[PDB]
Ligand binder design. Structure first.
Ligand code: CA
Length: 240
């Protein structure tokens, strides 16, 4: 997250760290959202590589013991069948991870609320991106969970020529674009939390930013629109 602030410890308890085994240790690669005690929603492109993955729930500081973390292996990966690695701009950037064990829910570990199927937010809707991703273009991961205020940019504006043009699809949510605050590498797969009827719900799964950089004026951060995938998510869980 570029132009973020450190989140309060108990703020976003559905946020997870997706990590891969690296030598004798673990490296954060992506965010995700705990949606069941044994299911995490993330981006498909986070799990393209044939790596060993683990999920960390209740995490806040990547580099120190918080006394709140639970560590769980990834048992099964279900990527959207239409996902194409060579074509992130086609969409379908979404995957479900079945955890080897059910995690314990507490103040630091809670299920993310998902929007109703088909829901589209009005332009300039209040949302927060959260994650441990780079804090500057070509920078380094945040040690502590960051948040940034990123209001939505609706499909009509986002798909216009001076924004993303045809790269953005109706199956996506754009947020931000002010040249200051954005998602960045390492936030992928994480949530965009938007306030709807008094309740934060996860309306986005972080997907991509501009090749020009993370915080780029009129290149809002692009998220898979979670409300486009409710039936698919329900079907995967019901059948695994
Ligand atoms: Ca920690």
């Amino acid at each position: 997250v570029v132009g973020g602030t450190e989140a309060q410890r108990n703020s976003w308890p559905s946020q997870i760290s997706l990590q891969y085994r690296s030598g004798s240790s673990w490296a954060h690669t992506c965010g995700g959202t705990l949606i069941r005690q044994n299911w995490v929603m993330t981006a498909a492109h986070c799990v393209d590589r044939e790596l060993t993955f683990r999920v960390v729930v209740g995490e806040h500081n990547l580099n120190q013991n918080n006394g709140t973390e639970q560590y769980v292996g990834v048992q099964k990966i279900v990527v959207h069948p239409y996902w194409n690695t060579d074509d992130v701009a086609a969409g379908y950037d979404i995957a479900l991870l079945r955890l080897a064990q059910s995690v314990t829910l507490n103040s630091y570990v809670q299920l993310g609320v998902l929007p109703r199927a088909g829901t589209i937010l009005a332009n300039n809707s209040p949302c927060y991106i959260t994650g441990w991703g780079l804090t500057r273009t070509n920078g380094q991961l945040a040690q502590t969970l960051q948040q940034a205020y990123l209001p939505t940019v609706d499909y009509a504006i986002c798909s216009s020529s001076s924004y993303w043009g045809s790269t953005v699809k109706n199956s996506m949510v754009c947020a931000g674009g002010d040249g200051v605050r954005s998602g960045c590498q390492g936030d992928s797969g994480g949530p965009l939390h938007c306030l709807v009827n008094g309740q934060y719900a996860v309306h986005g799964v972080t997907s991509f930013v501009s090749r020009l950089g993370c915080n780029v004026t009129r290149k809002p951060t692009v998220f898979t629109r979670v409300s486009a995938y409710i039936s698919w998510i329900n079907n995967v869980i019901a059948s695994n």
